[PDB]
């Protein structure tokens, strides 16, 4: 029988007004015998009718996949509204329903701290610039490193880790050639999170 | 979720913890875990092999009923430090009546060149000194394989108010992580010396420490 997964928008889409966040209902294991699928969408139980449902696509195991996509208002998602995908199929005695929303709980603002490389690291050709982001809830967050108004490529960020007070934390490591560091170039760790003013802050680091 | 649908047992085979393998005093175990075992058929049978030779030293623990009816069943095989670190292979064969055939899983040490971790302790940001508790960071990078243990201490005593990130794959194919120890600012300001302890197979004596203080 059909299976339904429901996917949330990307944090960067919800945190920036000029972008379009979307919720995505994906149905799989749709039969050749019953290929036809109907989507109803609700926002806090209020049905809405502007979802874009895509034509079904047979997968390489002879089963169909049907995707329906609902654009969401930023404020609605951030105010914790519930988004419900109801999936009707002749092979379903009752419609499948999945619901999602933002993580519930008192949102908490991240604290952002940039840490220079350890003196011990200075004897190598590349150094580590560290951005610690802690005390934030929910775990959804986007962290980016940039320099001279441009993104940096050689950085990796740990996934969020549940800290002892129920908030989350992570670290982002930027690797740069030591010479760029010694020369006094300025680096910035940018953070986006719902509980920040304007959903945004940045901290800078340099010698 | 008190009733029970299904489609055969599921087996996961876990390696010994880094700390048990890197210290001769401790006891490294390989653990074979079986979930989705049916109430109708709770009997599970394990066979263990080391490079194909059957061994009999394993100890299976009593079944564990989960919130669904399904049982969980665990078998634990203690391994020799040398065997694991020299790359001997451990097979767990799981037998059950809901299975059309025995499930086999194998595990062994990561092949691929070990790389020594670099350990860097990082003091709290100036900006964090406005707060009541401060963050002491230990960056451990450039290591392979990912199996690693990081702990904190001060003055001969463990310091356990920390969290450590999972290992993250870096862009050069090695791993890194960060460990954050939270201490009262007063203890930092008092000039107490804290120490990040790292255990990994590619380290001399499988052990190194880096200290951190005001
Ligand atoms: C026939 O083939 C089908 C397709 O493929 C294949 O065959 C060939 C082609 C192969 O080459 C290969 O491609 C395929 O094998 C098969 O389809 C399957 O069916 C699976 C089983 O149901 C299903 O697994 C679920 O996977 C989700 C995760 O999904 C996402 O990840 C997978 C893996 O990477 C992706 O494939 C998939 O596309 C999903 O990815 C996300 O898609 C979103 C929508 O597009 C993206 O978001 C949007 O992106 C746009 C971008 O333009 C925009 O940004 C929008 O804003 C945004 O919304 C998103 O970016 C993308 N993310 C990523 C990372 O890629 C899992 O979550 C599920 O796990 C849950 O259920 C299982 C049991 O079913 C359970 O064991 C788990 O524990 C999970 O349970 C939940 O648990 C959590 C906590 O753990 C709880 O919180 C929940 O309460 C609990 N809920 C439930 C209900 O239990 C599933 O494992 C596959 O995803 C699906 N594949 C595809 C392509 O659709 C099919 O099986 C085959 N049929 C047969 C008979 O063989
Ligand atoms: C029916 O319900 C069962 C039970 O599920 C859970 O129980 C129910 C009632 C709810 O409360 C659930 O929320 C709850 O999770 C369920 O069984 C689970 O099945 C899934 C597959 O569907 C298994 O998932 C996989 O997970 C793999 C990774 O799993 C480990 O890490 C998780 C944390 O993320 C733990 O929760 C697990 O218990 C497990 O822990 C590991 O355990 C091993 C051995 O015990 C440890 O190794 C040993 O550690 C000691 C330290 O004391 C020494 O160092 C030894 O040397 C060493 O060998 C290991 O350290 C530890 N790891 C950690 C991080 O703690 C993942 O890789 C797979 O991809 C997959 O996602 C899931 O693990 C399993 N749960 C358990 C507890 O086994 C059924 O699926 C349900 N069935 C249905 C139909 O609903």
Q: Which of A57, A78, A101 is the last residue before a domain boundary?
A: A101
**Residue bearing tokens 């929303």:** A101
The upper half-sphere exposure of residue A177, i.e. CA atoms within 13 Å in the direction of its Cβ, equals 3
Is residue B2 domain-resident? Answer: no
Q: Are residues A1 and A55 in the same domain?
A: yes
Phi, psi at residue B20, to the nearest 5°? -75, -35
Please answer whether residues A161 and A168 qualify as being in contact, where contact means their C-beta atoms are separated by less than 8 angstroms: yes
The domain boundary, picked from A70, A101, A132, lies at A101
Kindly give the pairing relationship between strand B157-158 and strand A64-71. Answer: unpaired
Residues A204 and A107 reside in one and the same domain: yes
A182: domain CATH number is 2.60.40.10
**Dihedral angle sign, alpha carbons of residues B16, B21, B23, B25:** positive
Q: Residue B194 C-alpha to ligand 2 middle, in angstroms?
A: 34
Claim to verify: residue A93 and residue A112 sit in the same structural domain? no
Rounded Cα–Cα distance for residues B107 and A164 (Å):
33
Q: Which atom of ligand 2 is nearest to the CA of B14?
A: 58
Q: Are A86 and A101 in contact (CB under 8 A)?
A: no
Q: Please, which experimental method was used? A: X-ray
- Record the resolution, in angstroms: 2.2
Pair A92, A3 in one domain = yes
Q: Which of B120, B123, B182 sits opposite A121 (nearest CB)?
A: B120
Inter-residue contact B135 to B129 (CB < 8 Å):
no
Coil, strand, or helix at residue B90? strand
Q: Are A21 and A14 in contact (CB under 8 A)?
A: yes
By CB atoms closer than 10 A (0-12, 13-18, 19+), residue B32 is: buried
User: What is the distance in angstroms between the Cα of A8 and the nearest Cα belonging to chain B?
Assistant: 24
State the pairing for strand pair A155-157/B103-107.
Answer: unpaired
B52-58: long-range contacts at Cβ-Cβ below 8 A with a sequence spacing of 24 or more?
B52/B91
Count of CB atoms within 10 A of residue B171's CB?
Answer: 10
Measured in degrees and rounded to the nearest 5, phi and psi for residue A108 equal -130, 140
Around B33, how many Cα atoms within 13 Å sit in the side-chain half-sphere?
9
Nearest to B79 by CA among B41, B32, B121, B27: B27
Task: Report DSSP letters for A46-83, one per residue.
Answer: EEE---EEPPPEE-TTS-EEEEEEEE--HHHHHTT--E
Q: Do A158 and B170 touch (CB under 8 A)?
A: no
Nearest to B105 by CA among B14, B22, B42: B14
The H or E element that residue B188 is part of is: helix B185-189
Distance, CA of A83 to CA of A44 (rounded, Å): 7
Give every CB contact of residue B143 below 8 A, 6+ residues apart in sequence: B115, B116, B117, B118, B167, B174, B175, B176, B200, B202
Q: How many helical (H) and strand (E) elements, i.e. helices and strands, does chain B have?
A: 3, 18
Residues A29 and A81 in one domain: yes
Please state, as a whole number, how many other Cβ atoms lie within 10 Å of the Cβ of residue B17. 14
Give the contacts of B161 (CB within 8 A, at least 6 positions apart): A164, B181, B182, B183
Q: Is the CB of B17 under 6 A from ligand 2?
A: yes
- The span from the CA of A61 to the CA of B208, in Å, is 52
Choose one of A76, A101, A126: the last residue of a domain.
A101
Question: Are residues A116 and A139 located together in one domain of the fold?
Answer: yes
Does residue B130 sit at the A interface (CB-CB below 8 Å)? no
CB A6 within 8 A of CB A23: yes
B121 within 8 A of B198, measured Cβ to Cβ: no
Distance from CA of B170 to the nearest CA of A (A): 7
Residue B164 lies in a domain: yes
Do B174 and B99 have their domain in common? Answer: no
Q: How many domains does chain B have?
A: 2
Tokens of A65: 């996949």
Q: How far is A159 from chain B (nearest CA, A)?
A: 8
Q: Do A84 and A109 fall into the same domain?
A: no
Contacts of A60 (CB under 8 A, 6+ apart): none
| Domain coverage including residue B132 | 109-214
Contact between A51 and A104 (Cβ < 8 Å): no
Residue B115 domain flag: yes
How far is the C-alpha of B205 from the C-alpha of B23, rounded, in Å?
9
Q: Which two tokens stand for residue A39?
A: 């989507």
Task: For residues A153 and A193, give the distance between their C-alpha atoms in angstroms, rounded to a whole number.
Answer: 21
Q: In ligand 1, which atom is closest to the CA atom of A98?
A: 93
Contact B134, B40 (CB under 8 A): no
What span, in angstroms and rounded, lies between the C-alpha atoms of B173 and B170? 6
What are the chain B neighbours of A163 within 8 Å (beta carbons)?
Answer: 163
In Å, how far from its chain's centre is CA A136?
A: 15
Give B68 Cα–ligand 2 centroid separation in angstroms: 14
């Amino acid at each position: 029988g059909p299976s339904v997964a429901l996917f949330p928008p990307k944090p960067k889409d919800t945190l920036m007004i000029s972008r379009t966040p979307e919720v995505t209902c994906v149905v799989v294991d749709v039969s050749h015998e019953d290929p036809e699928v109907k989507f109803n969408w609700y926002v806090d139980g209020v049905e809405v009718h502007n979802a874009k449902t895509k034509p079904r696509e047979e997968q390489y195991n002879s089963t169909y996949r049907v995707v329906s996509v609902l654009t969401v208002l930023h404020q609605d998602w951030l105010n914790g509204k519930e988004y419900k995908c109801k999936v009707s199929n002749k092979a379903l005695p009752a419609p499948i329903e999945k619901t999602i929303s933002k993580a519930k709980g008192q949102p908490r603002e991240p604290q952002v701290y940039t840490l220079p490389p350890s003196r011990d690291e200075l004897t190598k050709n590349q150094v580590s610039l560290t951005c610690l982001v802690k005390g934030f809830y929910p775990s959804d967050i986007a962290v980016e490193w940039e320099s001279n108004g441009q993104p940096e490529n050689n950085y990796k960020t740990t996934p969020p880790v549940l800290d002892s007070d129920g908030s989350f934390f992570l670290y982002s490591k930027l690797t740069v050639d030591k010479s760029r560091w010694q020369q006094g170039n300025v680096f910035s760790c940018s953070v986006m999170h719902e509980a920040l003013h304007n959903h945004y802050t940045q901290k800078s680091l340099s010698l």
